[PDB]
């Protein structure tokens, strides 16, 4: 069922710098694509991002459900929402349809604020199609192309890293993973968030 609209997402961490990336394919009947702009990354808060991989309708439906819940939370509390709270709420939503579930394997990527000045701690985690959370503290990968990404990251991860080197690392890992999957690819985007700014870049991938 995940061969229908195959996709992949990825996210790494570094020294006061975090990265998230995805492929831009939308499939139909497995072996014929229809679009090269379907971004699996969705901005949700000023320092929280979420990567949804799986069936496209379930990706979109889960995006609107989470956007509803999020914007409700910032409007009532009148303050910015935390990554852990969003992760727990996402796990509850995926569990709430434990039977007949959303066929989506999401991830969460963002920053953790520790007020005292303020320190931005990286945060990354991944989920099954039910909400099997597992904190990882380094590279997090999820999708049909997950095995190739797991293979690439350990060879290419260098612990904490500069944001430029992080972009090179995550870009090479994603491009080498997507080239070895037939139903995943067709371009890529790499979002590198920092406290000062976010850099969004698209890669000259084997989109063909």
């Amino acid at each position: 069922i995940y061969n229908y609209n195959g996709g992949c997402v990825l996210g790494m961490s570094g020294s006061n710098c975090v990265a998230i990336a995805c492929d831009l394919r939308l499939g139909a009947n497995t072996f014929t694509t229809v679009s090269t702009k379907f971004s699996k990354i969705f901005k949700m808060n000023n320092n929280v991002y979420v990567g949804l991989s799986g069936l496209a309708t379930d990706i979109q439906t889960l995006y609107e459900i989470l956007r509803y819940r999020v914007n409700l939370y910032e409007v009532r509390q009148d303050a910015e929402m935390d990554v852990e709270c969003f992760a727990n709420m996402l796990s509850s939503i995926l569990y709430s349809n434990r039977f007949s579930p959303y066929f989506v394997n999401p991830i969460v990527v963002g920053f953790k604020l520790k007020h005292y000045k303020v320190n931005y701690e990286p945060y990354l985690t991944a989920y099954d199609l039910i909400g099997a959370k597992c904190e990882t503290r380094d590279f997090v990968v999820n999708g049909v192309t997950s095995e190739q990404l797991f293979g690439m990251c350990e060879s290419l991860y260098v612990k904490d890293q500069d944001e430029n080197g992080l972009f090179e690392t995550i870009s090479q890992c994603l491009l080498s993973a997507l080239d070895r999957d037939c139903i995943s690819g067709w371009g890529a985007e790499v979002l590198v968030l920092t406290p000062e700014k976010i850099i969004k870049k698209k890669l000259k991938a084997r989109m063909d």
Partner: peptide, 27 residues
């Protein structure tokens, strides 16, 4: 997936648990 997961979970100050199966159900 995870090389340093945490199967042990906190119920109370004097009760703890750990299990095997679908980790979403466990959580």
């Amino acid at each position: 997936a995870d090389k340093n997961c945490s199967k042990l979970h906190y119920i109370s100050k004097n009760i703890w648990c750990a299990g095997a199966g679908v980790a979403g159900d466990l959580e």
